[PDB]
Amino acid sequence: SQFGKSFKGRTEVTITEYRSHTVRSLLTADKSLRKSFCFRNALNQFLDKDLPLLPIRPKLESRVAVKKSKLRSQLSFRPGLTQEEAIDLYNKGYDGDSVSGALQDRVVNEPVAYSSADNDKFHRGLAALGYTLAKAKVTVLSRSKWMGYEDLPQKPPNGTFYCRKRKAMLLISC
Amino acid sequence: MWAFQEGVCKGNLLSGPTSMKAPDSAARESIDRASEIMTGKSYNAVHTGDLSKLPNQGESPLRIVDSDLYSERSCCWVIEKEGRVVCKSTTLTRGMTSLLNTTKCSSPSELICKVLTVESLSEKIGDTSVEELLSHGRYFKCALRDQERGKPKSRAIFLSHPFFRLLSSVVETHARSVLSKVSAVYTATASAEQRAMMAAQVVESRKHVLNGDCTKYNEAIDADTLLKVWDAIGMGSIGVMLAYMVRRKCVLIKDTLVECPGGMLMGMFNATATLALQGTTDRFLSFSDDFITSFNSPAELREIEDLLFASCHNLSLKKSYISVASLEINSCTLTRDGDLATGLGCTAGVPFRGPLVTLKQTAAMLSGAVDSGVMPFHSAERLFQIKQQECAYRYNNPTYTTRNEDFLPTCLGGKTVISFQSLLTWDCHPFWYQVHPDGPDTIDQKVLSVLASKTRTRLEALSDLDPLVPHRLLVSESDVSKIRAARQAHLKSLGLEQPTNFNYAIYKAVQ
Amino acid sequence: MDSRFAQLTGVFCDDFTYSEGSRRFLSSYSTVERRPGVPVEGDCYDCLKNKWIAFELEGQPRKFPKATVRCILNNDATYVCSEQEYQQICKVQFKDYLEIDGVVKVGHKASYDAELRERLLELPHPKSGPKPRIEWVAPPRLADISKETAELKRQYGFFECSKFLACGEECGLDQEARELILNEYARDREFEFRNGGWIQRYTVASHKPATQKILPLPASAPLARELLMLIARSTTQAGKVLHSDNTSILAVPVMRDSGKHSKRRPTASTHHLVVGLSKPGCEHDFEFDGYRAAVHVMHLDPKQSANIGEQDFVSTREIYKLDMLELPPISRKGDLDRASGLETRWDVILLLECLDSTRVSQAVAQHFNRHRLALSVCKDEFRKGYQLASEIRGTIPLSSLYYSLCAVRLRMTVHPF
RNA sequence: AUUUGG
RNA sequence: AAAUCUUUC
Ligand SMILES: [Zn+2]
């Protein structure tokens, strides 16, 4: 019962505290990777099992003429995943930590000295070349049928029910 | 070679200095300088400016972020064996957990509320009291700080008690909020380049610029100044307790405790120290000990010096200079108009730290350089090819790879040298996606993380959690076991091993 | 059961239904909806799950049975609950932010505030201090840099040979001869031999710094990359000769000679002595079976060796060359010489910057960058920014500083700015 | 930390 | 012995 020794005197701790416990070496990174052929084994595993499952994504094709200009701060607003998507990704077996990290809206300020006629937003590194980036609050609780819950009617007043059309638990507010 | 650059170059192409020297000498020198400033013979530590134009956020709810209360960085934990104080170095996570165990509290918020709610300093909050917490929080340990370019003599940082860390984190969060309210330059998400552009806009109306730095910054920001700023922004008893602990601080050097009543110890209240000068006057753009201001006549320069002296921001005569054609702040140099000064500037080299990590970091560095006008794209292409060749020379032995198929980097037994443009525009074999700066973590990074996490009797893992569960949720041993069992059962139901990695870029691209 | 949560719990469950129309959550603060004849165990009762829900502020637990479900309202407009459904319900319903009494404000004043304030008052306070007098003058001229270089040169002098800096050039011996020379040099110094590896044993240390002098520059450094790779390999493979394409070194652990029960295996913090071969013709010459070579040593820390081993010489040279001016030829002592000087010596300087773990050249470069952008500087103080001899100690860092200053002087002489 | 980098 | 309170299993 390490929980009784790590957090002696407390029967409950926050998830942040618990993870901090779960989650420096003078050896260089090269020697660490060489040790026990850990990097070689990881490369073999990646090439044999992990690599074939990687989804091939399309390449960038959009381009516009650009000219050197005064330094400016390009703002890229990368939106965060919505509840429906986050839940679908976690239920599909994706790493929950990565999904939670991506759940938050992100804003990136990058210095670029390059402008287009239409003032477009450029991809990372590809600014010189000109590769452009271009009621009831029905809530999806989960993608499963929780046991002993009401079936979704035609007019769900304010409760939480289960939808057959979409295999999920839907919460209707006001 | 840095001396013969046509443009501006700071010589950052090599890594920072390293040293195994003990921090005792540096800590002793810092304490001696603090004492000398305290006796008021070398520099000024008495704040005289008026901090009236600072909003009083006394009614703001007390906000605590738990992310910074736990970390692998060192910290000082104090024990009282038989009436004597023993200071031990331990990870900040372990120190905070021990603090919470000593005063039974579910989370730091409960500890803060209990500390602020007692009606006496001697009342018990578990196996301790507010008086004991204050007594223990004034003990610091000395550690060395190296790998800082331009600092051949490594500096001394100081590790504090978890209670001091908690109060400091609260006060610093609030001070940063006030700073952001003051001016738009202190927005949390602001790059050094954005700050430099803002400064160039601000100081465009005058002739001369005063690129300046403050000397003995930590040793000159007294506890009185911190308390004055905190009272100005309405910190209540938290600020008083923090100032009391700072005034009575002791540092354990070797095996002796040395009193350091003068000045703060290391950069901890950077927001408060900045806010001192910022609320004194709206004439500087300062980030701790780095400020920029402009003047038109010698009288304005004398007024600027008077303001700096009154704000306890002693000017550094060694590295403060006046310029008319250039501006510099946060190590970023611009022209008066706002353009980035031609030259390498702050570009830093990528040391060899893995067959694929090196390529990814080099790609990120070259992308940053090319997005600005640091170098043209063809130069970046040539540099990337050269780096790939060097990585091939360094990492192409059987101890790293046993493959010979194509589509692999030449450093992993393959015979392909991906062009920088092809890599950047996702025009490569999927194996190269990791090498992209925005791509998934490389194999080497995962291997290093696993090695660190596998180096005992540990608790059950609590990774791969549902995105909807907050990290502030209280969980017991049974709760953790149930969560792990449910997640493993669901993953098995999918006929799946450890969960598949998720990458935002790939997911958005294929959506 | 606190009255401050009556409004909070009232809005928590507006019209939620559980069976067909009946309210799912019954408020414990309302007589009409409260269940009569049963004890109250929470702010609300959930009929669907047959549970009790209680609301508590951040870090302010309430006196309720453990079975009661607690929903924590954090101070940053976020809510936490073990039951995901209740958390979602509170998040959706509490969109209208209504402040609840008892929230701990940052300005909260404790009962001991006055006592701590008096204690702070009784404690020592600082004195005013003197107001500095600042005179702004022009930046240092070529004469000042020349004066600094001459002062360094006359204070420390020069070595007869380049020592380990000469290891960047071929020693003129094949692999077998190099290995033989290294092994026989190790044997001649009475190094301990154990498990086929060499160890240097020490008993007493004269606690004073070693002799410091400026190393003259070899002609070139063709094997800089090879030398750095060898040093990187030696961080762990110590005690046996390590071979490269055109050079070899021997990193022997330096271990205390406690006695019969002495350290046998190197630990994390054990230092290394790196021995390298160069062309003969200096004091450190060694001969064996007709093979002659200059054997030069370097005592390196673990962190020093690690830092030196990770540097990328070729990429750094190319990046510097991207936007560089015409480098002039220089002599053995870093002096402008267009008659017999060599431009390859600059490469050597770069190698020195890689071998110096204190990276004093970085500080010199930062100060020179300040110098080139400066219209006026503080009198008699900015000039005292190139005087870094006190901040470093050793032959390698001293030579690095001296040649950084020489490079600054050469830039001022050849390409005035 | 040598097992295992030309 | 050396980049010397470091080379401290
Ligand atoms: Zn010699």
TrEMBL record, chain A:
Highest taxon, organism lineage: Viruses
Protein name: Uncharacterized protein
Origin species: Tilapia lake virus
UniProtKB/TrEMBL annotation, chain B:
Residues reported to bind Mg(2+) 3: 213, 289-290
Positions with a binding annotation for Mg(2+) 4: 213, 290
Keywords: Metal-binding, Nucleotidyltransferase, RNA-directed RNA polymerase, Transferase
Binding-site residues for Mg(2+) 5, renumbered to this chain: 213, 290, 328
Sequence positions that bind Mg(2+) 6: 290, 328
SUPFAM superfamilies: DNA/RNA polymerases (SSF56672)
One Gene Ontology MF term: RNA-directed RNA polymerase activity
Residues annotated as transmembrane: none
InterPro entries: DNA/RNA_pol_sf (IPR043502)
Binding-site residues for Mg(2+) 2, renumbered to this chain: 213-214, 289
Protein known as: Putative PB1
Species annotation: Tilapia lake virus
Gene giving rise to this polypeptide: PB1
Automatic annotation (TrEMBL), chain C:
Residue sites binding Zn(2+) per the record: 161, 282, 284, 296
Superkingdom field: Viruses
UniProt keyword annotations, A-Z: Metal-binding, Zinc
Protein name: Uncharacterized protein
